[PDB]
Amino acid sequence: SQLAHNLTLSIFDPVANYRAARIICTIGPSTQSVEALKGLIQSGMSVARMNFSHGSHEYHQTTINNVRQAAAELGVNIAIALDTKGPEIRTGQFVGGDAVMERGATCYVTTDPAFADKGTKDKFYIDYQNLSKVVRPGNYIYIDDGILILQVQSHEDEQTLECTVTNSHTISDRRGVNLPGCDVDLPAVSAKDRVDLQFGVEQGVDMIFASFIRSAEQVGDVRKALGPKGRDIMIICKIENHQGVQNIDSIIEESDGIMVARGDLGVEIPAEKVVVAQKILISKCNVAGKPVICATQMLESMTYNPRPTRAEVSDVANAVFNGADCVMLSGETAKGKYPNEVVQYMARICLEAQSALNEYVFFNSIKKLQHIPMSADEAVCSSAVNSVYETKAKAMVVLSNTGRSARLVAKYRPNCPIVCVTTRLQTCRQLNITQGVESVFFDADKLGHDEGKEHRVAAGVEFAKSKGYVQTGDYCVVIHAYANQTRILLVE
Amino acid sequence: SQLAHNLTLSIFDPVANYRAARIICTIGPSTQSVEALKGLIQSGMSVARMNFSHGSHEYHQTTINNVRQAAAELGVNIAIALDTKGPEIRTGQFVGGDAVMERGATCYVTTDPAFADKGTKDKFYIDYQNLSKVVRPGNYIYIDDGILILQVQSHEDEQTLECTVTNSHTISDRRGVNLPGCDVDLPAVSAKDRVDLQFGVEQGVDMIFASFIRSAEQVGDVRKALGPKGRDIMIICKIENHQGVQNIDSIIEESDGIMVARGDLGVEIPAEKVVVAQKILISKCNVAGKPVICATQMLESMTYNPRPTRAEVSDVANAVFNGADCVMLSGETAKGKYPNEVVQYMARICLEAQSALNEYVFFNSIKKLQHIPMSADEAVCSSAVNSVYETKAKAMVVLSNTGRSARLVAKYRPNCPIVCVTTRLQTCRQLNITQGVESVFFDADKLGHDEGKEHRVAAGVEFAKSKGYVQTGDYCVVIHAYANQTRILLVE
Amino acid sequence: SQLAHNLTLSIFDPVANYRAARIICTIGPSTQSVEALKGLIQSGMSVARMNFSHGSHEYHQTTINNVRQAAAELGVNIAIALDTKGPEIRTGQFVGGDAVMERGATCYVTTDPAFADKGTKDKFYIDYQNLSKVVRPGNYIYIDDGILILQVQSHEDEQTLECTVTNSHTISDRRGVNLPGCDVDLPAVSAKDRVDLQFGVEQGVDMIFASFIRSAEQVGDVRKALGPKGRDIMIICKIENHQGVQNIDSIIEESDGIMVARGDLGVEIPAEKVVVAQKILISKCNVAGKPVICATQMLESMTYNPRPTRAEVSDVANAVFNGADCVMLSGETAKGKYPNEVVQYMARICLEAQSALNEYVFFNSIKKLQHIPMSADEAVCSSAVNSVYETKAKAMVVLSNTGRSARLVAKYRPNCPIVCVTTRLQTCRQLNITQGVESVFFDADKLGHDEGKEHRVAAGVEFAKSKGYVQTGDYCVVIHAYANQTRILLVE
Amino acid sequence: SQLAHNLTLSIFDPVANYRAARIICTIGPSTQSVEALKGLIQSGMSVARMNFSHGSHEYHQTTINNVRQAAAELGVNIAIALDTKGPEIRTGQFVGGDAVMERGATCYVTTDPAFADKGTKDKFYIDYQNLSKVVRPGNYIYIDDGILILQVQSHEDEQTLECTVTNSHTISDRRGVNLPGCDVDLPAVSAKDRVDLQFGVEQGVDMIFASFIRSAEQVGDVRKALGPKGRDIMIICKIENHQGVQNIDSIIEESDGIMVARGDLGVEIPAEKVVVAQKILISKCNVAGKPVICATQMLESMTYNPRPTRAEVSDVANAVFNGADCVMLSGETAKGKYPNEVVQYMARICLEAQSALNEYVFFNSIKKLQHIPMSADEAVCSSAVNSVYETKAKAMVVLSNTGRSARLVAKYRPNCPIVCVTTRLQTCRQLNITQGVESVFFDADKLGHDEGKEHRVAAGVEFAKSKGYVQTGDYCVVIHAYANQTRILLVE
């Protein structure tokens, strides 16, 4: 019924009084200082991403420290995400640091370590030791962000493949390779990841963006790598190839959420199919009640230009229309010239799209897919959201300690803000990747367990009032316990 | 969707484990004793009806006292209803106590009091002083349960009408007359009614069955006759003629419920149209959320026969299918030979019909008619019933002091029993005219105020457990404070 | 959505301009003459039933001849139904022609032929030779329209059962017996049936009402008994016991329609369960697109009284509300005092009920149960009816040679008349048991095959105009070929 | 329910066997030759757009002639569109052909013709004579594709405005100006337009893309300029500013279709609001049943690059998801380096998006918005598309001479190809802007009138068979005469 909703819209009508979508910002030289982070927060950042593909632990410690300091000074809660380097397939080195590959020419790719240092255009090293047994004749080898394409002709020997160069491209040392038609059987985490994941646990990071997730089993490996002390850290699986896409159901099941890495997917998969995979992955996550992130190549041109392209704007809006919880910035904030302006524009685009989005369509579609009998939690949350639509309530208040009930309510897409009142600061931070929720910390050790729920509900209603969401005479739908209890509250 | 439900049914499946419909019994010489009343209660009586058309105040006092004693000995709460004699139009007396009226003959009906004692076949008295100004030429006068029909030809004078006798019938003294095409402007209540109603209040009757209600204004007159001390007494308007049917919407709005008096309606309205009138009135009350009673000619032949006719059985079942809260027995229990058996059989027909009735059709139809935005009470009660269907809950517990929210929940027709927990014994009695509800009395003077609701909630759950409605691991939907709070409870 | 429809009704609003339901009349002494049949036709008879339980072939030949003559003189088409005696279980004869059975007494029922002539209260004959092997201890034997009930205690021998008399009842010779808890394995047709069925084929009867149908296999036996020359005769299966009810799905599948014989069912099954079985059977037939007849005990009291009871009126109306194509009269027309008046009242009741009935509920419920993909026929007919509702067309015209397409359209319950134009007179007659259809004969041998369909469509539109169904500017939905072609026609 | 559909998708499933969306290509020096036009057609061009902002009548004559020759050699019918230059507001000339405008500086814009040749940075000419009376103080003047922004301070005199230069930009002679907050009251069409439009009619163009449409009245002006001989030519209104968006409802009603000119809209409206405007306009046209074109900035970077950006790809796909009939290429085909490749890639994106698009959502949404009662044409066309879904038909055949009914069927979005059989070659060409339709020309002069429709029906079925849409035993939904007749045909 989005079509019917479109008919009634006017672009000169006022936007909504809240932005549901959440913005993730990659931190770098442009943004690591406390003042720059404060600018980012004020601009609309909810999550600070650390890209562990670059920088040392000391560098990322500065990010961690500065984020917390910036957040404390503004009196907000900012999530900290550790995005892993992950397993990689790279070529070796070349003689003269270069190799001119030409269309029609024959070359030999080998997994023999002896050729790691002495590669040429004729024969060179690829560090993936299972390359030969995974590839068949006819398969393609992509090298250097998929620019150079090789086609496998035959097995020259156990370690060496005879290849045709399908297009002219010059490659340098240690370039990344992709196997578009092959199942890559590299482990879930690299040696570097294990060290980085333990550091993340020690430093109290909120979530892991786990690279190159290909199967459900690998999610559990990441979990093992985090250890017992890292059990409450969210694992967001980055979907980067056909295996991740094909195994999406079982991966979603095990994960705490999904990143749609469009650029990485686009190395192996045609761009038009990636648009569609984005649609599928987001909708599957919406149904699972798990956060989903739209990432890479969002407003890329705004890295060095003061404005992005028109197509980039439509990309951001359509991620929201698709149902994304979050939209992500990489180089635009990490190394960009206009970090504040890009985040501010991203927020503006999201808000505009949201105002056009018919939330009821999401609620109705998701409700109709539920199997009857529903469990108590599911019934309470869907009914609560239904009560919002039926009474035209102007806010929801959800008491949630772990964040579970808040995510379950957000899943059903009410057309008003959700205020989550929680007794855990880490819940405040982790809910920053869930659309349409804002969190209020209730310090139970300071103020009491509030067994009758009245103090926490009042904290919720008050926050909603301070934001202008509700006033005297408005309805507010309250849910508390997982979640098995609902009230329709008249605001005083 | 009753059609689809019919397809899945088997008459060899076991009946439901509860009966939703309620049975009202008229008390008389067959049934006035404490033992006969106990037999009635055990047989399925929820409401004792006193017909104030017959008997003295002392006689009805004995009914009141004996009902209370029988109910107390069985540990149940039974409603007491006062059915008013109502205003009446009667003929006067005749010379020789008889008048042979013949087809084709001319007679004269007069409102002159002089002819009250000396009526003949040629000229006789009718005590309705507004008869002449209300009737036009061509209108019919029905006399003696509509058996004798006269047609008005002209005004002989200000007090006398010239009539044709349309059919041969012999009438005796003081026979009741009907004016099928005329608006009868008799007061809402007679002097006897006003006297009887004050007696009702003194004796603490639960409800009035107010005879011959024709307009909304008239409901006010009953309320005023009940006075400040009778404010909590329900007024059930008896719809007996075309006027009550025409004015049904406004009457319902002012009343606490409706009785469809098929027999009386049938005097002036063709029987097939009364069947449809029954459908309309019941549905309107179902939507209004107010009790509706199907009464007169229910299992009439079982007054003196050990079994009813097959058509009588279908009549009762279809009353239930129509949506009636209550079915009513008159002579069958008042002066009948098989009072226990007729009630037991009525209960069995009702239970059978219910097992074939698709409650969801009622729920959905009524829900769809609700105006959006809904008020909090309406939204909470429909949502709670919806949750029953979604979780396949096996009971509802409703905390309701006045019975209001119990009736609001019952309106939406869950497919499980409703247990009302109330602090007022009169609420327990009054809810006996609401289908699908059983009341549990919680003695606040003896047990406390239960401000946390936990004791009353547990009492409700316990009652449901003792009746075998719920066991360990079943869901129970709990609703309480109007009612703005809901819980989905897992039964321990 | 019948409930929603009830809210908008007024009993003082005009009835519909057509009666959809069809009336079947049993012919007898009261009605066999041509003039009485003409009276019956003019009163509302569409089908003349011949009860072959009584009367000789010569008697029924007079019925057949007189029906055709009466129909020809009024210029209408009247269906002729042969209702078979069917297989029966009877007791033998008694010494003195009588047997006084008393509660508590022991008696012996035997299948030994020697006791056929010499029965007593102690020991008597039952002609069902499989009685002993079909009955277990504890089972009941009903005798004399189920008035006398015996309980089987043990097998006295291979042919004799020891029985307790559960109630006092005096029985005479050759009384009918019932086995409520037993599968009766008597053949589908009796010896008498075979002779009667062949006579029916020779005389060109339109349909058989086949008695005591218990299983799907038996329908085929009736078909075999009709022979190759009787292949177009409709077999309507009379459902009279639990076996018929339990096997209803497979029976409907094989049959051309169903009679719900309430009185016969009521011998073995409690009356309240028969009400429900009526609901189930009718809805299952509505879904199968096969005619269903509500029969026995319809307005029985109008056999000798000038008016029926109020409950009888509600029974007739509720048969229509249930979805019956037809309602049937037995003794009311066969031997009754008021044959014309009873048929006229039956028509009036049906028309009143129909005016209150929400046809869209039937259409919608039936459409939603269709499996997708639908076949072409199903899609065309449902769409055609949908087009009636969407354009508010005032009539349908269906060209059907066998009647198949007309029944398929009628199944979907448009809220306007269906005019079937057919090239077969027998189709005109057979459609008289399908609700909401009227037939126009088009003599193709006289007027041409009308390959372009224009003459037949014009015949349809003209008939609709002559009845006042459509006028200039109204829409008419036309369907022709089974049926794969639709037109929405503007009436000139 | 796009959400539910997304769940069932796999990007590794094969794409649909037809492309519904249509590709419009702008002709220029890269593409004007018969061979280049043939390459365009084979690549996926359905419509040749002539941009009358550039080139002479002789130049466009050559485009017209070459299009017809290329189409004839490939045996296809290609639409020819004349896109008007439209009315324009331009600045005058400058001394030295240049003017350096600086932030903070004051300048004077004048409508006095004397300054047309002698403009400077201080004072210069704007050819819109109503400039002063249309603009208020505070309004902005955009110049040179909205790069230079001026703010009006006051009226210096009747012809001169005092302006602040809000940003530094250097402008040259005759630059286009925009008035974002002002209603431009220029005539619908310029003198050139009126001349060009008469040329269009003489040369038999299929459609006009009318520039800068701001009101419904203006559509009339285009129609009048086309004259009596241009009555069958479609007018597609180009929505380019806030006025066209505001007045969209009345514009749609008067026009034959809409072009959403994102680039032009973007000069005065923020890009994120243009994305939403696109959603609104497309949905409104989908409901109106009129063609809608998504145009400007489609795959722009592919003008000089061999591949587009990832965001450009998503832009195209989302145009299709929005519901666009057509996507349009401008410079990419007019003067681009990869004209064949850009069209081929556009076709591939469109086909991919379509395979993910749930057509049923469109069908249902549009059907639900229809007013009941419906007219015959609307009812027949929605019902035919409904029948496609119900029978899972694999093609539709629509007989449509003017194309009206073809467009009406396409409006309801069946999930199979539509084959229009038409007797007019201009209908074949005009339907090229309607998604999901392929036209078959039936030469009535050479083949007959086909009064029975059988030849045209067979031609439609045959075409569908040759394209592999249907084979033996598939269903095909046939619709013809407006269109009031429907057939569900089993393919032989």
Ligand SMILES: O=S(=O)(O)c1cc(S(=O)(=O)O)c2ccc3c(S(=O)(=O)O)cc(S(=O)(=O)O)c4ccc1c2c43
């Ligand atoms: O390869 S090493 O760098 O020596 C290395 C070191 C450590 S550490 O001692 O705990 O740091 C590992 C811990 C746990 C591992 C698990 S598991 O999730 O714990 O089951 C699985 C695999 S496997 O590659 O999938 O077989 C491991 C491979 C290599 C590992 C470790 C693995």
Ligand SMILES: O=S(=O)(O)c1cc(S(=O)(=O)O)c2ccc3c(S(=O)(=O)O)cc(S(=O)(=O)O)c4ccc1c2c43
């Ligand atoms: O018992 S009889 O009266 O001698 C007698 C006479 C004839 S007749 O010669 O055709 O008139 C029969 C014709 C067809 C019969 C069929 S069937 O449908 O044709 O298969 C079945 C059974 S059965 O009882 O189910 O086994 C029959 C039983 C008795 C029959 C006939 C049966």
